[PDB]
Design a protein around this ligand. Structure first.
Ligand SMILES: O=C(O)CNC(=O)C(=O)O
Ligand SMILES: [Mg+2]
Ligand code: NI
Ligand SMILES: [Zn+2]
Length: 331
């Protein structure tokens, strides 16, 4: 069995190996990468996502989200307070302001310590979930706006044609902006490219141990657990590495820098934070190996998790028994 300790693997494809996306994902899996829940891919030195980032300031963040925390330093929830629209240039200035900028620090480890110690006492503003792409149309390799669609994968594997589309999303971050513990919708893969700016630290639980994290979360968030049998689909709960270690939950951590891809694997719980002003692009995708995960994925039917149009068909086809109840949640 490859990678039995479920370590995060880092890959360095050549330009020739970067041509065929599906084939490279399958290669990484042949070496055990999926067992970690997360892999890093460093693109060949010849590759570029686009020529420059010099002309992005006029992108609109229509609904910036202020991430307000409740709880204790290592065990907290966050809610998102909607703010007035602003451009990327306005948001960058805000991120660099004395109120929001990254503090002086020695290295990534010192910054991580400061994040866990102090996150809850601040409310950073995240430009998350913005439909669009920063890949140049002429970039042919690993262009997240040109991937094979999940609808087409389901059709190829299962023979059923379904409605829906699959497009990327931009994330503009600042110091302390946070992504809560989650897996993807329908336990899909995700891929994330850090286009520019400061790093993003990730934490991940191996898929084979995801239920250990769920059981801890039910203990630590007992009212939420009573409210919903899949409340981590709400994407609001944070648990620190110190707390995970105290409770024996297996996990790993890694920092992504500008110019690097991360891939999350089906049912790989992940969480993390941004170090300062940055811009990432991400999309979900599927492979043949995902189908069995999609069939078994938990679902939120309490009404909180509220998701895309395209998830309807996945539930309807892969989880027909759950369909009725899940759709009541969506309506
Ligand atoms: O970058 C973020 O805020 C969150 N990204 C992801 O969870 C992902 O790419 O799967
Ligand atoms: Mg612009
Ligand atoms: Ni994710
Ligand atoms: Zn719910």
């Amino acid at each position: 069995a490859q990678n039995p300790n479920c370590n995060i693997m880092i890959f360095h494809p050549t330009k020739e190996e970067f041509n065929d996306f599906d084939k490279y994902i399958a290669y990484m899996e042949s070496q055990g990468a999926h067992r970690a829940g997360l892999a890093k891919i460093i693109p060949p030195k010849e590759w570029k996502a686009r020529e420059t980032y010099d002309n992005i300031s006029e992108i609109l963040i229509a609904t910036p989200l202020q991430q307000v925390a409740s709880g204790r330093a290592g065990v907290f929830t966050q809610y998102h307070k909607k703010k007035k629209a602003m451009t990327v240039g306005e948001y960058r200035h805000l991120a660099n302001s004395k109120k929001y900028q990254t503090p002086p620090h020695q290295n990534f480890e010192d910054l991580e310590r400061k994040y866990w110690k102090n996150r809850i006492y601040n409310s950073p503003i995240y430009g998350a979930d913005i439909s669009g792409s920063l890949f140049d149309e002429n970039t042919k390799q690993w262009n997240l706006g040109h991937l094979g669609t999940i609808q087409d994968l389901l059709e190829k594997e299962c023979g059923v044609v379904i409605e829906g589309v699959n497009t990327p999303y931009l994330y503009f971050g600042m110091w302390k902006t946070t992504f809560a513990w989650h897996t993807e919708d329908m336990d899909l893969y995700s891929i994330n490219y850090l286009h520019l700016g400061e790093p993003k630290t990730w934490y991940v639980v191996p898929p084979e141990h995801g239920q250990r994290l769920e059981r801890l979360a039910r203990e630590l968030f007992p009212g939420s657990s009573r409210g919903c049998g899949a409340f981590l689909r709400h994407k609001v709960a944070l648990i620190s590495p110190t707390v995970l270690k105290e409770n024996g939950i297996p996990f790993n951590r890694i920092t992504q820098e500008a110019g690097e891809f991360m891939v999350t694997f089906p049912y790989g719980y992940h969480a993390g934070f941004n170090h300062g002003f940055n811009c990432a692009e991400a999309i979900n995708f599927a492979t043949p190996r995902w189908i069995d995960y999609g069939k078994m994925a938990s679902q939120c039917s309490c009404g909180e998790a509220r998701v895309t149009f395209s998830m309807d068909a996945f539930v309807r086809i892969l989880q027909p028994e759950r369909y009725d109840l899940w759709k009541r949640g969506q309506d």
